[PDB]
Design a protein around this nucleic acid. Structure first.
Length: 1337
RNA sequence: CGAUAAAGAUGAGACGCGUUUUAGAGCUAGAAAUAGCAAGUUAAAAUAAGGCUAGUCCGUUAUCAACUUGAAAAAGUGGCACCGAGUCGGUGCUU
DNA sequence: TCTCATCTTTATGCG
DNA sequence: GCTGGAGTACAAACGT
DNA sequence: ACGTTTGTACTCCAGCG
């Protein structure tokens, strides 16, 4: 019955907890120990931390699942092609598909001849000599007209089907036009034939170099416009050019039609939008857009084809043949020149596969970039190569055909080649003539993304209904799958359900019922006064209907002047009224009513009371689907109510948005007595005209009881399900769930007593590829040449200053000067908004500068002169995706107002109050689980108080008060942070019961800039004895009520004793592994038993396979094995690692699995399931953790005394120095006077290593390296000792560095010692324990 | 209040590689060892073993100390106080 | 590497 | 980058 | 006694865009 408190520190991979009393003391209790050990009771402290691995997102699993689906569908495509070809294939060569199936087999396992295509050596050699690549065969079958073998036709068609390319370009692509300059001249000719007043002159323009350039699309348009004499990118020619490159232009202002008419060629809606545009202006511009389409094809095809198209119908195959021919000729020339000029480095280039030469390029694993990097110095140190260097700098030297540039190849090229093959060979075999559309559909059947996995009720990711039960093929997909219902389910399964009625789906944001609801809701707020009335009054329902009918149906946006004039003056004959309750402009509007009035061109139809469900279905259709024909098939039902042009304008109309209020709420639920819905109470309420937010909270109305009945239904969810519903990363969700479980166990431990204080706090918590992509895109967008000035590497970007040099254009900001790369030390990183106001160390806030004083003022946002001068550079960098919109606003805030003292006071308060939403959610969960009972009038009795703090409080309490934290010593700092959070939170709510609404989650009512500035600058000043000098008393009082909120005489020793306290329950969370079976690398054949078979009948010694499996859990077994030739039963005890592949078979029957492994007469009751991170105690406190069935981890925590921790923090200069010169001078003097503490810390590390960290050679190397560097300054020695604490850390072993000397990790390949040790089962807090003595087994 | 921008989460539809085994008869001089020379660019198949519900589906996310009750979700199980502190110990009281 | 959809949260100015 | 698996070279406890 | 397996040191590798 003792009052206490709980402090929490929640992180992504660590949760800390502590129980404190009223006097800020951590209790200790005797906890009973279960098991067969001699120990029965252990004294443990109520402070500790839980450590776990970080939670992972489902993105990797989703990508793997999508890859599996794609592989299955590609195999099905090949199966469909084989099914088409099989009837004639059996007549030509019946074993052909069988030979192709068994190609991945050795000669001993093949049931047929080893030659896949022809089945004999001579024909295979002749085929490979005639067609060295498949593209030679594809070009031959497109071009030649003689009869070919059916095998060759199938091989070409299957190569096109298997590798069909992308579907990014929708429509038709014609490869017959490939000259950029010719169609650019044609476009200019058409423009001059149409426009005669201002013709475009484009003679002497290098069209091919400009339009097919390697920089960005927008910069390509800008470079064409800059060359163009007297033309504008917003002009008609500029719009046509931008449309040709594919950047979407706006044709509104060019033609003055008052609709956008945006045209994008890659979209299938372009044809209908161009039909609309032809209806707008006429058909005289159609040839102009046809020329623009042809020039767009010329741009998008000249990058990939790079070959003549007038001599063949297969430009891509001709391009690949050109690549093969150039590779052959330059290979011959390079071999000749190497043999002539450098004959010693011929074996390295052409025979050594380990090097990055041609042998490494072809046989080895070297890529194209690595081969160029190897061979370019060879060509430079040689004087007979110019064309090879020219091709190498053009990335066209010794090219392969299956490269990484094939990702930009459209499916139209492969489709055209397939169609050409089908057209050439249909007259000879009639079955391709009868099945031409079948094979073309097989190539061009992409499942719509709104129709998910074609499932039959056994999938969690499927939204798809079948019109008939039938096997879906590419040819009957349209007839079997109901596509409209599938797309409706696609949108509706991720749309929200409104909170008041959890089983009801929300309306679209642009619904007529929703806008009627909002308009009437705002109209209830309107109140009027005019002469003769003794009191303000509200508009009756007949009046409000009349106001909607005039003002909201006419205006689109009503203002109070309009309603006053027309309704009060024109109708009600009140010449002068004062209007209240609304702004000058109204917020609510009949937006979709006005859009439908514009489209339908009828007004009575939309006004009608009983047609409104039709228009709700109309706007539902316009919100759900984005594909044109889906929208078409839905308005075929309602088309006969409208005109065909009207229905087309409906077809092109869009609404993008969903509300958060359902339909049955607005007009479905009604009161028991009145029978009027909430919309009707907004329409007419007698005199009162009361509105929504109270109507869901009104005691007299039955809306509140129906809403609470709806919320109660379903009983909410479980704790895990409520946790997964939340926002944020899954790792923080794991942290919160472990926090809640820790709180529940802590409540159970104390004797089911709940504390009237819970203080929580939350941490704020690959990239390099994003960095390279961002810098490349920036230099392409703005035309920057910084990469061409000096190119750099990828691992070099990890340093902040080098990245910040390359991110900006070689300059520093606020001044127009270039700066140089070599001067690393003399340049510094600056923050745009100063560090004193806000904390933001990201690149979004940081700037690298050479002189920070040119910012105008030292502590403010950059001066308005700097804004007015650098604004053009800021705008052009914003358009180049190198700064953010937030960065733009932060730079341009000076012209927009700068920093007000209100804004500075906000940037002072923001470090103290936690406004993060996830912390509010955690506080709500803990408040709901702790405070449960209700009292009279149904109010929640807040027996447990949940306080939320930010890390600034605890960090300042550590920094000001010599409670320093060093993270590299041990994980005790997590529990220490939790304890300090508890102390600070309870002290703050004891001293200031007025800041409860700011610091406590709850329903409270307690709440200019300068007083706020001093308040939130000085909230922690009651902890320190001297202010600034002000001498506050040693014993602090709450004020207006007498309690001891802080006692500087004795509480300080209590906090220091809790921080200097050796036993802290550090628990590493025991987990069973979830993940993939093995490493994803397929390694070649070798005679090892550690290789895993890729299929059942693929022996790894003959086919290769996977190597390194992941152990799910280790299993302890006591059994007898066969030993010697006599096969004698020898008793053994062992750990066997059950992998994820083996886990299902093991849990199905452990005895059969162990008998298959070799162990005999195993005991089912003696099998102990040991997951990863299980704890074993051996002797002298040496505790080991289980990493696998062959490797152990170190689990032991070095309880280094707090004086050494403080000395290490002050000596190493953590976070540089931020304090008064007297204070840091005194700290430096203290560090100087205690240099023997280094030797004492080395003694502590050596003794703790010799007791539990059995690494003799590593410790000897550590001591030798320490003795080498005793003359170094104390700061460097302290930093290197902080590095030295990696040896004694709890967890997996890792390498660390002492100055220049490095020490590799001491690892274990044996787990034999823990088999005769005490196995410890630890609860989540670690207080409740179970010890199993494994030596008794 | 809508709005703008960015980030994150979730789900679907697609590409291009990469790896692996096989196919693409390597020649000459030697007893072999090996040396010299020729050639190299492509294709098939697999791309988590696999499973049953047999779908052009699913299989790498989240949850997970021990014991007991369990169909599971989960529920239940473990005195207190004081003096101390090198991973927790001792003393007293009581069930 | 690309296309599409939904949701939430934070930062940016109005009132 | 992390840290567990795998290979190699070799000396040392250890069982037939 | 001699084999032999085990304990130790050291190196290398990890599917991507």
């Amino acid at each position: 019955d003792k009052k206490y408190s709980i402090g929490l520190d929640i992180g992504t991979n660590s949760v800390g907890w502590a129980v404190i009393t009223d006097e800020y003391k951590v209790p200790s209790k005797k906890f009973k120990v279960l098991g067969n050990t001699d120990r029965h009771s252990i004294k443990k402290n109520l402070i500790g931390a839980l450590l776990f691995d970080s939670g992972e997102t489902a993105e990797a699993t989703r990508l793997k699942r999508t890859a599996r689906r794609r592989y299955t569908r590609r195999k099905n495509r090949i199966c469909y092609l084989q099914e088409i070809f099989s009837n004639e294939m059996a007549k030509v060569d019946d074993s052909f598909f069988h030979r192709l199936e068994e190609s991945f087999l050795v000669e001993e396992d093949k049931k047929h001849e080893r030659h896949p295509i022809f089945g004999n050596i001579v024909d295979e050699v002749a085929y490979h000599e005639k067609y060295p690549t498949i593209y030679h065969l594809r070009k031959k079958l497109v071009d030649s007209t003689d009869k070919a073998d059916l095998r060759l036709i199938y091989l070409a068609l299957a190569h096109m089907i298997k590798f069909r390319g992308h579907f990014l370009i929708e429509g038709d692509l014609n490869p017959d036009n490939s000259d950029v300059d010719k169609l650019f001249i044609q476009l200019v000719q058409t423009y001059n034939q149409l426009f005669e007043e201002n013709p475009i002159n484009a003679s002497g323009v290098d069209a091919k170099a400009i339009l097919s350039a390697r920089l960005s699309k927008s910069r390509r348009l800008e470079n064409l416009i800059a060359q163009l004499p007297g033309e504008k990118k917003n002009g008609l020619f500029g719009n046509l050019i931008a449309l040709s490159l594919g950047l979407t232009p706006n044709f509104k202002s060019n033609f003055d039609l008052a609709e956008d008419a945006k045209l994008q060629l890659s979209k299938d809606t372009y044809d209908d939008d161009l039909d609309n545009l032809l209806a707008q202006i006429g058909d005289q511009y159609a040839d102009l857009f046809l020329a623009a389409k042809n020039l767009s094809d010329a741009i998008l095809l000249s990058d990939i084809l790079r070959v003549n198209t007038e001599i063949t119908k297969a430009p891509l195959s001709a391009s690949m043949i050109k690549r093969y021919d150039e590779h052959h000729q330059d290979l011959t020339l390079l071999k000749a020149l190497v043999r002539q000029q450098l004959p010693e480095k011929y074996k390295e280039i052409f025979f050594d596969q380990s090097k990055n030469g041609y042998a490494g390029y072809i046989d080895g694993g070297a890529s194209q970039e690595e081969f160029y990097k190897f061979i370019k110095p060879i060509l430079e140190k040689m004087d007979g190569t110019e064309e090879l260097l020219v091709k190498l700098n053009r990335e066209d030297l010794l090219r392969k055909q299956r490269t990484f540039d094939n990702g930009s190849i459209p499916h139209q090229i492969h489709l055209g080649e397939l169609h050409a093959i089908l057209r050439r060979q249909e007259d000879f075999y009639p079955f391709l003539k009868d099945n031409r559309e079948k094979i073309e559909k097989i190539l061009t059947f992409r499942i719509p993304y709104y129709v998910g996995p074609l499932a039959r009720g056994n999938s969690r990711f499927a939204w798809m209904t079948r019109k008939s039960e039938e096997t879906i093929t590419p040819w009957n997909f349209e007839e079997v799958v109901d596509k409209g219902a599938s797309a409706q389910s696609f949108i509706e399964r991720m749309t929200n359900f409104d909170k008041n009625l959890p089983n009801e789906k929300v309306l679209p944001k642009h619904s007529l019922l929703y806008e009627y609801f909002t308009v009437y809701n705002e109209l209830t707020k309107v109140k009027y006064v005019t002469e003769g009335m003794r009191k303000p009054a509200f508009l009756s329902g007949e009046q409000k209907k009349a106001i909607v009918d005039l003002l909201f149906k006419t205006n689109r946006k009503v203002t109070v002047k309009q309603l006053k004039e027309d309704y009060f003056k024109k109708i009600e004959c009140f010449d002068s009224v004062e209007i209240s309750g609304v702004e000058d402009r109204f917020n609510a509007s009949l937006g979709t009513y006005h859009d439908l009035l514009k489209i339908i061109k009828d007004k009575d139809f939309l006004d009608n009371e009983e047609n409104e469900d039709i228009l709700e279905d109309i706007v539902l259709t316009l919100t759900l689907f984005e594909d044109r024909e889906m929208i078409e098939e839905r308005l075929k039902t309602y088309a006969h109510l409208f005109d065909d042009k009207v229905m087309k304008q409906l077809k092109r109309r869009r609404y993008t948005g969903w509300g958060r209020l359902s339909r049955k709420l607005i007009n479905g639920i009604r009161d028991k007595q009145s029978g009027k819905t909430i919309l009707d109470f907004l329409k007419s309420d007698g005199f009162a005209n009361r509105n929504f937010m109270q109507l869901i909270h009104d005691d007299s109305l039955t809306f509140k009881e129906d809403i609470q009945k709806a919320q109660v239904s379903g009983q909410g969810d479980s704790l895990h399900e409520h946790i997964a519903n939340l926002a944020g990363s899954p790792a923080i969700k794991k942290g919160i769930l472990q926090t809640v479980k820790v709180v529940d166990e802590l409540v159970k431990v104390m004797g089911r007593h709940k504390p009237e204080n819970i203080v929580i706090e939350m941490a704020r918590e690959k990239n390099s590829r994003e960095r390279m992509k961002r810098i490349e895109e920036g230099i392409k967008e703005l035309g920057s040449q910084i990469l061409k000035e000096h190119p750099v590497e990828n691992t070099q970007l990890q340093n902040e200053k080098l990245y910040l040099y390359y991110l900006q254009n070689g300059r520093d900001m606020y001044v127009d000067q270039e700066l140089d790369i070599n001067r690393l030390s003399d340049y510094d990183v600056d923050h745009i908004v100063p560090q004193s106001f806000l904390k933001d160390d990201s690149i979004d806030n940081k700037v690298l500068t050479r002189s920070d004083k040119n910012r105008g003022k030292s502590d403010n946002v950059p001066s308005e002169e700097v804004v007015k001068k650098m604004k053009n550079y800021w705008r052009q960098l914003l358009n180049a995706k190198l700064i953010t919109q937030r960065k733009f606003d932060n730079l341009t805030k000076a012209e927009r107002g700068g920093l007000s003292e209100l804004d500075k006071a906000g940037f002072i308060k923001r470090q103290l109050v936690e406004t993060r939403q996830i912390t509010k959610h955690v506080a709500q969960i803990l408040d709901s689980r702790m405070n449960t009972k209700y009292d009279e009038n149904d109010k929640l009795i807040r027996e447990v108080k949940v306080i939320t703090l930010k890390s600034k409080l605890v960090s300042d309490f550590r920094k000001d008060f010599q409670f320093y934290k060093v993270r590299e010593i041990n994980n005790y700092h997590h529990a220490h942070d939790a304890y300090l959070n508890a102390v600070v939170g309870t002290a703050l709510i004891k001293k200031y019961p007025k800041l409860e609404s700011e610091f406590v989650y709850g329903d409270y009512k307690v709440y200019k800039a300068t007083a706020k500035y001093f308040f939130y600058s000085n909230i922690m000043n009651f902890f320190k004895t001297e202010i600034t000098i002000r001498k506050r008393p040693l014993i602090e009082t709450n004020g207006e009520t007498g309690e001891i909120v802080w006692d500087k005489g004795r509480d300080f020793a209590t906090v220091r004793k809790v921080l200097s306290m050796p036993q802290v329950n550090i628990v590493k969370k025991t987990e069973v592994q979830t993940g993939g079976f093995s490493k994803e690398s397929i390694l070649p054949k070798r005679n090892s038993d550690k290789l895993i078979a890729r299929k059942k009948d693929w022996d790894p010694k003959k086919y290769g396979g996977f190597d390194s499996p992941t152990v799910a859990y280790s299993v302890l077994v006591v059994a007898k094995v066969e030993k010697g030739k006599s096969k004698k039963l020898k008793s053994v005890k062992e750990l066997l690692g059950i992998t994820i592949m083996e886990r299902s078979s093991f849990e199905k029957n452990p005895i059969d699995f162990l008998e298959a492994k070799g162990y005999k007469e195993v005991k089912k009751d003696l099998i102990i399931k040991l997951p990863k991170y299980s704890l074993f105690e051996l002797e002298n406190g040496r505790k080991r953790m289980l990493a696998s069935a062959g490797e152990l981890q170190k689990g032991n925590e070095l309880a280094l005394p707090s004086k050494y921790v403080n000395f290490l923090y002050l000596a190493s200069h953590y976070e540089k120095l931020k304090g008064s010169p007297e204070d840091n001078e005194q700290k430096q003097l203290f560090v100087e006077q205690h240099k023997h503490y280094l030797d004492e810390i080395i003694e502590q590390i050596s003794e703790f290593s010799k007791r539990v960290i059995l690494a003799d050679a590593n410790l000897d190397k550590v001591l030798s390296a320490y003795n080498k560097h005793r003359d170094k300054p104390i700061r460097e020695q302290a930093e290197n000792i902080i590095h030295l604490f990696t040896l004694t850390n709890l967890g997996a072993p890792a390498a660390f560095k002492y100055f220049d000397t490095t020490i590799d990790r001491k690892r274990y390949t044996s787990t034999k010692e823990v088999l005769d040790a005490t196995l410890i089962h630890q609860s989540i807090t670690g207080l409740y324990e179970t010890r199993i003595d494994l030596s008794q087994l």
